[PDB]
Point group: D2
Chain length 326, copies 4
């Protein structure tokens, strides 16, 4: 049986409320030990080692937790046969992407969470964590880059997102689909992400103690420029626009982002729109303004790629080619 | 044959000879913007031009860019007092394109503006052979012609062969059943939207608090949750006399109460199924009436 | 606290102490089959046991296998004359499984059977935190817990924290608004379903015509279309005195009239949004009343 | 510019009604020439050659049309740089699969159709056919097996199905997702089907003038055994069950299929259910009855695989291993 290391970070899978019925819960109160002992059947498929790295809600996920996970997975690679990372639902898609571009362990790296707290009736966390371990233990999971395993389904870190606020089935690769389905502890793998991941990326976080500063700004009718401006006045290395439709920007937001791209801030056009690419060649001259199209990356994911891009180049056209390959 | 007025706003759709088959088709250009530049002033014009010109026509069609169609449909849904069909339409493909979608969309928007059954269902969006309510409807894909969907409660009816089988009607109060009277107003309260993600900056939310914004809507993570910095700045703003509504960047499901955020403790308002841009619509109009978190939340539970 | 009766039928769900929090929970085993063996007789029992025991309780919950839940919900939807909540529930995972779905499903089915707002919405299916109408609801995935969806018109409301925000109600006539009275009947007309695909055999459709089947439903291709052999055999059957309803194997959208099939020329009935198994439900009950293609089609347009 | 051969078979893209508005149309009336000249912009991306192979509605698709297409594509492979196949919507998913297992031309083979007739307002066929040609002309489309190109989206022949009866967006790979998206005549390919296709399959139709006889039977409440029986009395080589839920069968259907599997008929359990696998190890003992699980193949697609399986073996366990690899 293979050696599997769980790195716990908290989330709802390690979450707790005074009632199994009521929807009221808090997170950061429940240790990995508890999670493992709530899933006894684990000892049938793996030798499980729990380390707590942090205990937080993922709404509170941040750069320094990201650096710590990659360095740790990179460091501990050859002392285990795979990792599961227990994590909150809320920014799971952001952390899966970041580790997808930064881990050089091509052994299975599998994120799992849960939507209902550990205390609640028909809690999803147990079967979810079991299925994370199957996937982390399956030799076929290797070289697929970093994975999210939720609701019997193996999702790639790049395309996976949360679709619903409350649904146990919220996790979906809404653009290119899942990689495989888990039935009875086996997986029929039918897809692997083509975009470059893990040991095929030039991104090395082994020495960074910081990440470039990149903010997200939202677009809508009568959008204030004050958020765009506040980020510029702080001298931000990059900004991502959550554009409307095909990555389009309200007049006021557009002019402030035009200016900043010329004083050398990286500006990436993404979209608030849940599926589909922010394309080049539509209503925006990218090459004129020194803007980069996000493609299928939603704003929070374009942030991750851009922070990582900014550590190699501040050049608009090389940052475009990074958003075309990763 | 019905008298249907087309209000043009611009967008990806701006000649369909078969309209004469179904209606007397009179048409006025209100403005000609891309809908990414849609603003409160266009909104107040549309609200008034429809409230005034209601007795004059049997129904309305509003050609609109696709980008902010869901913000304008819901605004008109809460401000319009005409319970004759009001139908918004756009197109994903240009009029100069192979298989442009715009022609059939306009046709089916006029079928829908002319159907007596379409009355009293609130402001509607007709795209891709589908009648959608102005509240739940949003754009799900950056380029697909089938982008427009009621992703929480689903569509009101399908249009086939210029006929509608209507199996649903929105329960949330719309049009003449709302206290939002916009006929005297020449500006709406200033409402911002801020985005949550990992290591979220508090500078967007601070900038808005510094301008004396009436309202701020959080595009939270998951179930409306806030990064700590933003939670700190907004917790402060909710008693500065800035109204704070928690919504989600997640494109379906409700931002609920009774989760991880004690809303009464901060004077925060859960948006329900209102995504952020839609939440700003209701939050703006709520603030023409009250700044009471308790009473703002009562309006999020009724419209 | 409401008096809620649970009718057990078997399935993947057949001890939730928190039920006492919300209702007086009395429970009777009507039958214990897997729902793949669901039949007309179970259906007539359920219809009668609910029509009789209506005055006796404040609402109903029916534990059912997931496989044929959408056929039984729609049958009960057209036959039940109790306009008190009737709520069907099952589970995708066994009760002996990690994270079994069944416990919370039953809980939320009793929340829904006990909500006064749930009255007069027809027979409901409550799965995965969601209230779905018996007509539009179907299973979309062989193993996912989120399988049950109203794929054409969407759900009636979401259940959160034992509360329902109901934003929709089915317009198609249900329960006491239908002429289907099943209280005297001990069998339903024999209706078959045949499948269309490439090089489709006419032998299924022929076998059914040879038994003197009252009705045959085509799982057509695309918009209800038929392979030539099946079209020939069914064109014949529609004037043999076998009623023929065109539905689709395609899991969403309506089988429309005015497409490629002249329905009046053959005496065929377009199913609308009724998938084949649901179409058999309505076709069976239509034939307790008429064999008139014109009048059968009128019932497909109303229920 | 590359040499692209269109093989026309009819369908709605070659369909016609007396009114652009009304939904009334017939098919089999309009020639390939017409379709090409309605898309002038084609000459910008390819040298287009039209051959009419048949003019029928795809509701009328059959074995002999299937054999003719494969033999033809196989034969004419090295006399062109790619094929588009214009086809009806209704059984497009059945023909795409069949050619996916039978063409040994690893040059792009791309099926296209349309939902609105050629005569109708905002007809989809023109842009659809243009996008079929982009895809057929794109070197990256080679070795992806046979494709369906519909509504700006490149779908694999194995997983692609029609989801809606009337919607221009009906074509979807509802299980594993699309392969790529088409914007402005370019494709970002992010996936390739893992299941074995084209020149990796043992299936050779180069000499067959017939295909084994395989029927589909539907399951539902109070399901008649008479359709199952009629297929047996005709001595059918195989039967596919459109089961309920996880590929389950009503009592009466089950017993007749149990009998036939023992007199040597191949019986495959599929599902009427639109997405998800008919799994082994659920409520049915497959190995006991000599039944094969379909996996993700819907009934019409399991038919295609089974007809092709029956031409190599009548053995239940080898037919299972074929449904596990193809």
């Amino acid at each position: 049986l293979p050696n599997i290391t769980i790195l716990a970070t908290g989330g709802t899978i390690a979450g707790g409320g005074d009632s199994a019925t009521k929807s009221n819960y808090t997170v950061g109160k429940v240790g990995v030990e508890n999670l493992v002992n709530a899933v006894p059947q684990l000892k049938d498929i793996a030798n499980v080692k729990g380390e707590q790295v942090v205990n937080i809600g993922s709404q509170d996920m941040n750069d320094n937790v990201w650096l710590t996970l990659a360095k740790k997975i990179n460091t501990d690679c050859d002392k285990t046969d795979g990792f599961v990372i227990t994590h909150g639902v809320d920014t799971m898609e952001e952390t899966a992407y970041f580790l997808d571009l930064t881990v050089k362990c091509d052994k299975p790296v599998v994120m799992v969470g849960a939507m209902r707290p550990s205390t609640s009736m028909s809690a999803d966390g147990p079967f979810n964590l079991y299925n994370a371990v199957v996937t982390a233990a399956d030799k076929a999971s290797a070289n697929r880059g970093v994975l999210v395993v939720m609701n019997d389904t193996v999702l790639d870190g790049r395309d996976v997102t949360t679709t619903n606020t409350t649904d146990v089935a919220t996790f979906k690769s809404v653009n290119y689909g899942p990689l495989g389905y888990i039935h009875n502890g086996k997986i029929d793998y039918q897809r692997t992400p083509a975009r470059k991941h893990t040991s095929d990326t030039p991104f090395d976080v082994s020495k960074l103690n910081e990440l470039p500063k990149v903010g997200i700004v939202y677009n809508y009718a009568n959008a204030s420029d004050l958020p765009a401006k506040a980020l510029v006045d702080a001298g931000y290395d990059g900004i991502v626009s959550a554009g409307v439709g095909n990555g389009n920007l309200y007049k006021s937001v557009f002019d402030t982002l035009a200016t900043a791209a010329k004083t050398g801030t990286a500006v990436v056009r993404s979209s608030r729109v849940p599926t589909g690419a922010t394309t080049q060649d539509a209503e925006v001259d990218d090459a004129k303004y020194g803007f980069v199209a996000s493609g299928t990356l939603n704003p929070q994911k374009a942030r991750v790629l851009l922070q990582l891009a900014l550590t190699q180049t501040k050049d608009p056209q090389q940052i475009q080619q990074i958003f075309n390959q990763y």
